[PDB]
Structure formats: structure tokens, C-alpha cells
Amino acid sequence: XXXXXXXXXXXXXXXXXXXXXXXXXXGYSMFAVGIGALLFGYWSMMKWNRERRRLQIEDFEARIALMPL
Amino acid sequence: MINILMLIIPILLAVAFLTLVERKVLGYMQLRKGPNVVGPYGLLQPIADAIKLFIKEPLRPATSSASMFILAPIMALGLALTMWIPLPMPYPLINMNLGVLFMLAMSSLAVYSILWSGWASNSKYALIGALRAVAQTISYEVTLAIILLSVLLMSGSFTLSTLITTQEQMWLILPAWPLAMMWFISTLAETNRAPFDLTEGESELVSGFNVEYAAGPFALFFMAEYANIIMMNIFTAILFLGTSHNPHMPELYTINFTIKSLLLTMSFLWIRASYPRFRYDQLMHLLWKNFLPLTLALCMWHVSLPILTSGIP
């Protein structure tokens, strides 16, 4: 018997198929997070600015209180 | 003064140890082994380049120019390493009367390094890489100041010391959501190792500020060009990041500040490997045509916000 190269089929590798698929973000869903992060962003930032006003008047008060300076 | 000397020598080492990361992280991004033979993990190779490029490499250009050319690597380091001084850090070296103004002015002055390298060779071959470097930087200086102004009006004044104190509960990434995305692109205004970048890398054209320069001036250019990448990474970690302040313990700040910057340090080399060059014409169309109306609309938005709800330092 003579032995040569043998053939293999099984699944035939599956040639030409789109492996690319959309993931995580769809379109409308990411905009709700996007503007949602903005709405949370400005609201939390301005609370510290109002807290800065408590310091702002009190810091400049030191110059008014000190006249022997 | 000891602080300045303790901010050049360890900083030049950080630009030296960058060369590891420039082909280790970039290597694994391309599925290839970087530094391995020279040191335990190639750690002796970055310090070997300083022995390689300066002591033995001798070139001076042919037709040349007069005093200029060799003036340009002095202009490269002596304007980009000075940028470390106005940095707020835990504590700044001579805290400026207005902080970010010195940061924006010296960055534009650092562009001259690639500009004077155009007249390094009198031949026309080198200045094409210089003329391309003009437009790839000149347009992006517009938004770089505008996007700053929208952040600066939101929090404090120009002083960099106030920018640390303003972020006590949450980061500035969340209120400035589209503006933070802009500072991954606008930071790459200077000739940096990136996909957007400028006329510095090879790929298509001849290497700008490298084809005219030797090894010794050319080696001095990399110690300045890669230094700007860390500088923009730290500057983003001040304007957009913060987490905590703590004036009592400087140890808790120094560890936490470095991790935030190092995550951004990887991110620019992440950009560099991933994407091709944007072309000379079409980079001028990304901004100006498309991004400048977007940034000004957000600049219009950030003017109204302190008036709408109280936000004045």
C-alpha cells in the first residue's frame, strides 16, 4: 500500500463570514448616560461653589476686621 | 536652590525610562517582546542610549547654517523642561501670580524647536517637514486656549493652586464631558508620539527636526519631545482629575496623583500604535471646520453657567 497526503473535511473552516458586530452602545442609550453625566456634573459642581461663598466672605472679612494692619 | 536641580536630573531619567514604555507597552500592543536582553527586563538599555548617542556620535550638518541649528536643541530642552516649574503638584516651585498663562505661553514657545530646525539645513528638503509642522500646530493653538477658558470659568482663576482645591468631591470630567474628550486630541498639538501628531515621525515623509540634526542634537530633541507627552499627561490630571487634596499628609497625594497620570501616560502610546496619520490637509479639517464650532458652542454654554447658578471664585 502506498501512503500519500490525506484529506480532512469535518467543518471546512467556514469561509467568508462577518465577525464584526455592534456591542455595548446602541445609540439612544449612550445619550441618556451622556446628558445624564452632564446633569449630575453641573449640579454637584455648583454646590461646592456655594460652599466656597461661605469661605469667600469670611476670608475678606479678615482685612476689614484688622485695621491696626 | 536645590528644588530645580531635583526636578531636571530625575525628570531626564523619566524621559530616559520612557524609551522602555515606548516599545514595551507599544510592543505588547503589537504582540512583540520589547526590552529583554540588556538588563533583567531591559532596564539597562535606556541609560545605555545616553552613553551611545552623546559620547561617541559626532555629526554636524554639511551646508548648515551659522549660529542657528545648534541653538535649536538648546531651545528644545530649555523651554520644555522649564514647563515643570509652574506645575502645582503637591507644592509648586515659585507659585505663579497666574498659573496656566505661563503653561500656555511656554508651550507655544516650545514649538520653535521644530521651526528653527527648518533653517538648520539651507536645502529645501528639511523645510518641507518644518512647513508641515507649522499648520499641524498653528490651528490647534486656537482651541487649546478656548477649552481652557471654559474649564477656568467653571472653576477658580488662572492659578494652578486653586485647581486642586476645586475638586474635593467629584472630578471635572463629568461636568466637562465633551471638553474632556477634546483634551485627548488638543494635547497632541505639539509634535508628540501619536496617531494625530505632527510632522516628526517618518512613515510617509522624511523625519522633521531629525533629518537635519545629528545624533547629539537629534538625541537632545527626543529628550524634549517625549518630555512634552508627560507634561500634557500631568496637566490633564490637574484640570480634569483630582480625587483628594490633603495638606497635612503629602504622602497620600503623591501616590494617588502618579497613578492617575500613569494611566494617561499609557493612553497616548495606546493612541500611537492603534491609528494611522490624519494627513496634512485633513487634520486642518478635523479642527477649524468641524471641532471649532463645537468648542465655541460649549464656550458659549460655560459663560452662562456661573450666571445661571452661582459659580464665582
Side-chain angles (χ1 to χ4, degrees), chain A, chain B residues 1-189 194-195 201 208 214-217 219-313:
Chain A
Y28 291 93
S29 60
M30 206 174 181
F31 269 89
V33 187
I35 309 153
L38 287 154
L39 285 154
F40 183 79
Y42 301 128
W43 185 81
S44 59
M45 198 71 188
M46 292 297 178
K47 283 178 86 72
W48 182 255
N49 289 297
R50 288 182 193 90
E51 205 76 63
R52 190 168 275 184
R53 298 295 200 280
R54 314 279 181 271
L55 311 157
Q56 199 187 306
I57 310 156
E58 210 161 303
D59 287 320
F60 280 88
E61 195 72 40
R63 202 210 185 272
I64 313 154
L66 295 163
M67 210 68 193
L69 200 141
Chain B
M1 279 286 186
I2 324 101
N3 283 298
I4 299 101
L5 288 156
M6 285 286 281
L7 251 134
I8 305 157
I9 310 154
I11 268 79
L12 282 163
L13 284 158
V15 191
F17 288 128
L18 253 170
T19 60
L20 289 157
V21 190
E22 278 164 44
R23 266 128 206 160
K24 200 181 274 287
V25 171
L26 204 98
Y28 276 90
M29 278 278 284
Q30 288 151 21
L31 201 81
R32 58 172 182 173
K33 200 171 273 184
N36 206 40
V37 164
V38 187
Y41 295 96
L43 293 155
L44 287 156
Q45 200 168 1
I47 202 150
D49 293 303
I51 320 155
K52 181 192 168 181
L53 290 156
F54 298 99
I55 293 97
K56 202 78 183 177
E57 301 280 81
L59 209 140
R60 205 227 174 198
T63 175
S64 328
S65 48
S67 186
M68 274 191 284
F69 165 76
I70 43 152
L71 199 136
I74 308 164
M75 287 281 276
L77 293 169
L79 299 168
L81 291 162
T82 51
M83 286 273 280
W84 292 84
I85 309 157
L87 281 172
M89 295 291 279
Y91 284 97
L93 249 166
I94 310 102
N95 194 54
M96 284 291 286
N97 309 296
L98 295 174
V100 295
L101 254 80
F102 198 84
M103 274 291 289
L104 193 69
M106 297 294 279
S107 60
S108 60
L109 191 45
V111 187
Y112 282 90
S113 60
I114 207 146
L115 300 176
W116 301 126
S117 69
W119 279 88
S121 300
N122 80 350
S123 59
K124 291 178 278 285
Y125 207 94
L127 59 91
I128 301 155
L131 274 154
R132 191 160 285 184
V134 176
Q136 286 188 291
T137 321
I138 207 161
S139 294
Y140 284 83
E141 283 174 61
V142 178
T143 46
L144 194 71
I146 292 161
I147 312 155
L148 263 169
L149 279 158
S150 53
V151 175
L152 291 155
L153 184 47
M154 179 57 73
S155 61
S157 61
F158 298 115
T159 55
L160 277 147
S161 59
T162 51
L163 283 155
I164 325 149
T165 50
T166 190
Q167 291 159 294
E168 210 74 60
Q169 55 276 299
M170 299 299 280
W171 297 300
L172 261 149
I173 309 150
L174 289 144
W177 184 81
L179 303 170
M181 282 285 181
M182 282 303 296
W183 268 67
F184 284 95
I185 320 146
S186 61
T187 33
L188 312 170
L220 296 156
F221 264 92
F222 297 127
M223 301 297 279
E225 282 173 298
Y226 295 113
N228 291 305
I229 303 164
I230 330 152
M231 276 306 305
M232 290 291 175
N233 281 314
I234 295 153
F235 200 47
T236 44
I238 303 147
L239 292 159
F240 299 97
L241 289 154
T243 321
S244 59
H245 182 79
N246 284 297
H248 282 266
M249 283 271 93
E251 287 177 296
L252 291 160
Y253 186 80
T254 43
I255 307 160
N256 200 32
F257 190 80
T258 42
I259 302 157
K260 292 191 282 288
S261 63
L262 278 157
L263 283 156
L264 291 158
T265 316
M266 305 308 106
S267 79
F268 282 151
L269 287 154
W270 207 294
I271 289 294
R272 192 201 187 268
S274 297
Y275 319 111
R277 296 212 294 109
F278 270 111
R279 207 261 284 256
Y280 169 80
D281 275 359
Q282 285 149 338
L283 193 82
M284 296 277 273
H285 282 286
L286 286 163
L287 214 91
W288 216 281
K289 189 93 168 288
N290 191 277
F291 278 128
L292 245 168
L294 184 76
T295 50
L296 283 162
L298 288 150
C299 190
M300 280 275 287
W301 184 253
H302 275 256
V303 166
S304 60
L305 284 152
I307 304 152
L308 285 153
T309 42
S310 59
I312 295 147

